[PDB]
Amino acid sequence: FNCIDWVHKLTLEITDFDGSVSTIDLGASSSRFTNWGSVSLSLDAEGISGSNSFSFIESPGKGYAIVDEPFSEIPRQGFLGEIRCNSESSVLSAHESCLRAPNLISYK
Amino acid sequence: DPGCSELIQASSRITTCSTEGVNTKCRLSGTALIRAGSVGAEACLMLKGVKEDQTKFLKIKTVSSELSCREGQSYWTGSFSPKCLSSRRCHLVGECHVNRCLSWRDNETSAEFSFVGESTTMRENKCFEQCGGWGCGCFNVNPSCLFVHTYLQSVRKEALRVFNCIDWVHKLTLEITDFDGSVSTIDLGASSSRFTNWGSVSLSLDAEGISGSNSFSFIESPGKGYAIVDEPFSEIPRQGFLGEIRCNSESSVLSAHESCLRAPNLISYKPMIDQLECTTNLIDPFVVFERGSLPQTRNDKTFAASKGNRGVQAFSKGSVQADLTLMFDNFEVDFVGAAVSCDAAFLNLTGCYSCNAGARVCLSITSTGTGSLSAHNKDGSLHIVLPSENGTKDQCQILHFTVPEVEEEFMYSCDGDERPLLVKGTLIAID
Amino acid sequence: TSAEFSFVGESTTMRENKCFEQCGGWGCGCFNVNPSCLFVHTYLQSVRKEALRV
Amino acid sequence: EDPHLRNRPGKGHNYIDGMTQEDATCKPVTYAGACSSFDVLLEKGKFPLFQSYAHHRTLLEAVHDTIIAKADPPSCDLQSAHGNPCMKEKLVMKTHCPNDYQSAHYLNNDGKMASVKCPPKYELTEDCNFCRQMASLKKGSYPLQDLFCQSSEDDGSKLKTKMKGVCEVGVQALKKCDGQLSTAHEVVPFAVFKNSKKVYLDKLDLKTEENLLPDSFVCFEHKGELKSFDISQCPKIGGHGSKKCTGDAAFCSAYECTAQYANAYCSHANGSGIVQIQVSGVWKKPLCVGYERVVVKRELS
Amino acid sequence: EDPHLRNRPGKGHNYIDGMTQEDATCKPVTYAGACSSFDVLLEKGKFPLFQSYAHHRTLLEAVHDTIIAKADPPSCDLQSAHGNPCMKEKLVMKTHCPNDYQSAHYLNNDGKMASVKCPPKYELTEDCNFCRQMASLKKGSYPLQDLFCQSSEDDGSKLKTKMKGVCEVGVQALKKCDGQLSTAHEVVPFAVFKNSKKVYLDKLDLKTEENLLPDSFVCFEHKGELKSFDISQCPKIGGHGSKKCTGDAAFCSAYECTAQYANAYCSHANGSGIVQIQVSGVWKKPLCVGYERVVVKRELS
């Protein structure tokens, strides 16, 4: 995946009046419905620009990564992302919904 | 304050008279010309019948010099909030297909959301694939489906309309008074015409305007003050821009009508198998409405709102030089010769000489019957018209002079016999 | 020609038909939440008593 | 749509004098009624004003509303000699009258119901001015003026015709002209208040101001076609009136619903309100305003 | 179409005191015997929620299964007006009966069964509210709500209305309001927990776990009346059990099928089993969830 605008996220652990503990988060101007109502941000600052020329890799239960190249738009030969899908099950089971590069599988 | 400043006599070619019921009535089937008065002055029109006592006047009271606007492309906007529903279905259940879920249309109600009801709002139908198997709560090994039905609603009790200006039309709010005494308040801008009981009127000469109005967008608030934004008009509504969701009417925003224009792929989603928190990072126009609230100081002008009639104006500090066209649609002007007596007395005379505002004059008119007063000087360039009734009142108007030592003899009457009257007063020099 | 002003007729006078969206419900003077209509029948009239050939 | 085309609120009586051949087919006026003095009022391509303002009152309904008195005589005779009251106001008309008709009613200058009638068995001509020999003949009259009435009470005895620069319109003697008379048949509206004269106009400006009024509700009997039921027979909530009433949530919230004790189901309607008129700049409540096609004389010079 | 949805699990009783003399055919609900209190729930284009969840219990079936209690009185008497137990809970509700009915049931604020009643020989109006005078006389009750009921044991009687921003919705007065309100008939859902009240719903987020539970299937007696059959007695794949079972590929792909040598026939149902819902951010298992068109008074000014 890629990033177009870094959103300043603040993880909030809201504790109600009775004693119930709830851990949530807020970003930019999003609002989440809680037990007593809803909370949202009002003012944000400190933004990082120029993130369209980078691509990140997410791993299930392992970690993240950073790649110093623009994000893959169209799949083609000789570039990262020759066979792309939509979900993890589409990769582990090879479903027809995946998008591959035309004339990628060679033959002899 | 009343008072004739610029007075002119109508031409005899467009002035014809008749006689019906021991009365000499006259109609006008033409158009005259008179200079537009400044702040407080008037542009009276002397109407002569067949002799001297039968003289009528049409007062046009000028409020102040204003600059109206010309709305072209406008739209309504406001705050909104998403409200989406979640419904997870396992594979091989109804219409659970990843090929159909991937290319799922927004204007197609799914089989799991056809029981919502009458929702005439900006609704959409999305879909996202999740997990499956026995670990997620399904019988088939294939992943499950998650139909999404998102519809917008209105959460703010007020809305705002964003418009622009292409040419500051110099509007002059005129209070035209008919010959009989009917008072009518109208407005004229540049070369616009209205509709009055005596025909029609339109502004002629106009040499006042403000350039560079396209690069400024205004915001109208129902009831409260307006606003001003220092940016050009909003083009196409896209993500991360002021005015990404627009409509056409106020009810389309206060009730979230489906006939509105919004940014595509704006409503975010959080696929969490079962849960789905949908939030939208909408732009709040109230921040700009509070940072740029009228009145403000822009260059050497004063931008503010307008009373009574909704619209934005622009206060100026220049002179008032314009012309008026009094179009008469063949309207008769009757006049009954009164026979009541009056004994007027001079009071004071304060104001200015050779000024556009004129000098204020007051008299002590004391009559015994309800009628009108008609006065004139000696050479024929000054006239005094003031109401009269049974009792003792003090009527005041504005008269123009070109000398600080006013020593002009007046000839006022209330039935026929004219008596002399002398006025005096010290004036000041006002440019 | 709108039905609210079809009694005037299809004469040879410069005419036009406009319509603007308003408001409905009991807050404005209707019964339904749908906005009302505003049928406009604009026709021009000769103001000056004479013409000029430029 | 428009479910209020034939339903007449309040009275709803279209009785004409002289042409007494429809007394049992016009009182009242229901959905399935067969009244000759109301069928042509909703004809496509005839009276668009009545089609636009259908939920109002007509001329005869205003006469039977105890607010407009009839003329004397109410049914004029076109076969008279000299001195016919219904001749100067009838010959100057321009509205074409259809065939298969014998009577024709209109409004005079005084504000009374005036009508003409041919002797049996004659009918009207093309200009419906004389009487010539005889589908089937109608059992009533024909509306000559496209006007709508309502419930008003403002006085208009001090307001006269405001047609400026007009010589003589219709039959009224306005002012004296100095140029050559220009005879031209045009459409000039007319406004008649409560007990006033026929005041003509030039630019008719009509606005509608609707609110919580009892005239915005219709009713109809049950059916195990439709009928008619007056809305004035429904009292308020927590009380008892003359006749029983019932309705839906839009009717039971304002008036008391007697459940099955009533014999007519009421629904929600909208089309009444308080219609105003622009006369001399002041917005007043008109009584019977409409349009009339008469001879208009103007100045050529 | 094939009336396969008439097989109701458990008891399948649809009868109430007062009227409805068709209890000889509506007890139970099978193929034979026309039941007017269930045939209207199978026609497409009316109540799609009950058609999607046509494998659980209804309201009356929940009453006859020790789930929903009976109100006092269970049938409102519409003979005496000016006050009755069925006024506020029905006047705000917007429904539509296909006529020829007299009885209609709905849900009250307490959580019991509140129904109207028209004494013979009356009829319901087009809005199912009050009665009216007089085809056939259908004494059965008309389902006024598109609700579905099931069995659960999750406690949750400490939650009220979750809607925020509405002054008075339906019959519950959350807060007092005297200004202008947005009075409009909206479709707002509702839910009833274990021995709770009419808990209104702001959003509907269901959750059904399709597993091997008896509530997730509609096993009935194999043919070649019909009640609910416990699926736990069906033998597993590659093993041995008590009785015999059979079904389609969805059932034969998990258990053992013997075709004609089976005492019961099973089939995979659409939308059946443990049904959860979101409330206060915590998943709970309700009892009866449905929709209703009541008057919602939202805030404005």
Numbering used by the authors:
A (entry chain T): 850 to 957
B (entry chain R): 688 to 1118
C (entry chain P): 796 to 849
D (entry chain O), E (entry chain Q): 154 to 287, 290 to 379, 393 to 469
Authors' own words:
The resolution of the reconstruction was most likely limited to 13-Å due to remaining flexibility of the particles, despite efforts to include in the reconstruction only the most ordered particles by manual selection and 3D classification. The resolution was further improved by application of our localized reconstruction method, which accounted for the flexibility remaining in the fixed RVFV virions. We first performed fitting with the localized reconstruction of the pentamer at 7.7 Å resolution, followed by fitting the resulting Gn–Gc heterodimer model to localized reconstructions of the hexamers at 8.0–8.6 Å resolution. This sequential fitting approach allowed us to create a full atomic description of the Gn–Gc glycoprotein shell by applying icosahedral symmetry to the 12 Gn–Gc dimers in the asymmetric unit. Indeed, the improved resolution of the density maps for the capsomers reported here (7.7–8.6 Å), combined with high-resolution crystal structures, allowed the construction of an accurate atomic model of the whole virion surface. Domain A of the Gn forms a ring on top of these capsomers interacting with domain II of Gc, occluding a surface area of ~950 Å2. The Gn–Gc interface is formed between the β-ribbon domain of the Gn and the hydrophobic fusion loops of Gc11, which are shielded from solvent at the interface between Gn domains A and B. Surprisingly, unlike the rod-like array of extended anti-parallel Gc dimers predicted from the low-resolution modelling attempts, we observed that RVFV Gc forms a kinked conformation, not previously sampled in crystallographic investigations of class II fusion glycoproteins. In toto, our integrative structural biology approach reveals the shielding of the Gc fusion loop in the pre-fusion state by its partner protein Gn.
Virus entry is completed upon Gc-mediated fusion of the viral envelope and host cell membrane, in a pH-dependent mechanism.
